């Protein structure tokens, strides 16, 4: 049993996002809460709305939440929840999680079951794809059998990027920061990742679902 | 329904060594309180409901009491991988008019490993960057044990703006960081002084890495 969240992104504020949940691997045959718990950058979880799955439909908001959010079971297998009104308090990673209902006092009661999460940013900026710069060690330095290179992936809106290294062939050895947010609201992050120095190049391949861009940079030994 | 207060705020314990938190309700709220582990970039994972029941899977040196008001997690041979934040819940539902869901507002949970230095790394800005107006220097101090602080000096001047840090979790091993500094400045600044500094402090301890973008 799992769950897997969806239609997360940018919106301006004001805006209006509706985000459903998909429910895979469960058991009909019993009654579940489905619910919506929230995440703002560096902060605590914050429960949003619960909806039980039996045939009442009954849900359970969070004061703050009545009005602006709706959850409902649209389906066997997805839970929805709406939210308007939108200001850049509401940017958060939004988490479906499932618990048990109390039955006989039997259960599992508490979310036993989370999604990965799916990240909302509520800004004015347009989308904004990174520039990507390579990072060598300086031109002075005595070589060695190995070197750490790497990319800074600047000035994109909103997250996430992924960055790879020669496409997943460099695995071990990657160190990929998490991003700052700069006042002006973009991010930026650097990687770097460290190898045996050989004729093979070294890529980084940086891509921003966003903007659907891809951009590889090829990192020069600086040499 | 009832707020949670967890406290301490922030905990560090010795690899192997033993943790408890706390978690207190503004009412009473019987034994309808869980626990759940967060590490930085994962989804929460549930440890305890019922107030000590343990999850499925969950190791018994994690274990949960109470019940009313005050709670209590306590993790004992606390491992490098135990490093996270930690939240209790009140889950239950009396009636439409009487549920509850709310959390705690966490505890961060740091596992101390035995102190070790930074190695350090310095990136001067491609020549690409300096095109664009704007350059970033990089600064990389990796594994790590316990918090730096970092300076930057550009020609022996101390910088006091343009600095960005961004620090990794602690490693699942041995509980060291990473972290990478990086100070921006215009082309001009840049392409006007010689020696790029960056130091990496931990207490009387300091590692620092330069280069001269002359030769470069």
């Known amino acids: 049993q799992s769950l897997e969240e969806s239609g997360g992104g940018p919106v301006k504020p004001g805006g209006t996002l509706t985000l459903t949940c998909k429910a895979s691997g469960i058991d009909f045959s019993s009654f579940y809460y489905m619910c919506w718990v929230r995440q703002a950058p560096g902060k605590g979880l914050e429960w949003i709305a619960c909806?039980?799955?039996?045939?009442?439909?009954?849900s359970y908001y969070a004061t703050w939440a009545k009005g602006r959010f709706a959850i409902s079971k649209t389906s066997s297998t997805t839970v929805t929840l709406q939210m308007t009104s939108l200001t850049a308090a509401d940017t958060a990673t939004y988490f479906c999680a499932r618990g048990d209902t109390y039955g006989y006092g039997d259960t599992v009661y508490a979310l036993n079951l989370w999604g990965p999460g799916t990240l909302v940013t509520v800004s004015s900026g347009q989308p904004k794809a990174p520039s990507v710069f390579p990072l060598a060690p300086c031109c002075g330095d005595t070589p060695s059998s190995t070197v750490t290179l790497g990319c800074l992936v600047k000035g994109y809106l909103p997250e996430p990027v992924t960055v790879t290294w020669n496409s997943g062939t460099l695995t071990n050895g990657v160190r990929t920061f998490p991003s700052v947010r700069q006042s002006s609201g973009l991010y930026s992050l650097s990687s770097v990742v460290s190898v045996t120095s050989s004729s093979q190049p070294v890529t980084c391949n940086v891509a921003h679902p966003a903007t659907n861009t891809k951009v590889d940079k090829t990192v020069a030994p600086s040499t | 329904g009832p707020v949670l207060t967890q406290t301490p705020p922030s905990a560090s314990e010795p690899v192997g060594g033993t943790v408890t938190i706390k978690c207190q309700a503004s009412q009473a709220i019987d034994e309808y309180l869980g626990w759940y582990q967060q590490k930085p970039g994962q989804r929460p994972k549930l440890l305890m409901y019922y107030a000590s029941t343990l999850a499925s899977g969950v190791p018994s040196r994690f274990k949960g009491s109470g019940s009313g008001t005050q709670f209590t997690l306590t993790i004992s041979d606390l491992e490098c991988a135990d490093a996270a934040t930690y939240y209790c819940?009140?889950?239950?539902?009396?009636?439409?008019?009487?549920?509850?869901?709310?959390f705690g507002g966490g505890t961060e949970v740091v596992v101390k490993g035995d102190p070790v230095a930074p190695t350090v790394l310095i990136f001067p800005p491609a020549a690409d960057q300096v095109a664009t107006g704007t350059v970033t220097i990089v600064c990389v101090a990796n594994k790590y044990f316990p918090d730096v602080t970092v300076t930057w000096e550009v020609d022996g001047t101390t910088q006091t703006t343009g600095i960005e840090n961004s620090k990794t979790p602690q490693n699942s091993a041995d509980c060291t960081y990473n972290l990478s500094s990086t100070l921006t400045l215009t082309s001009t600044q840049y392409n006007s002084h010689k020696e790029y500094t960056c130091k990496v402090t931990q207490g009387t301890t300091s590692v620092v890495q330069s280069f001269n973008r002359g030769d470069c």
């Open positions: 909806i039980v799955t039996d045939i009442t439909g009954e």
């Open positions: 819940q009140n889950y239950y539902v009396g009636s439409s008019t009487n549920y509850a869901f709310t």
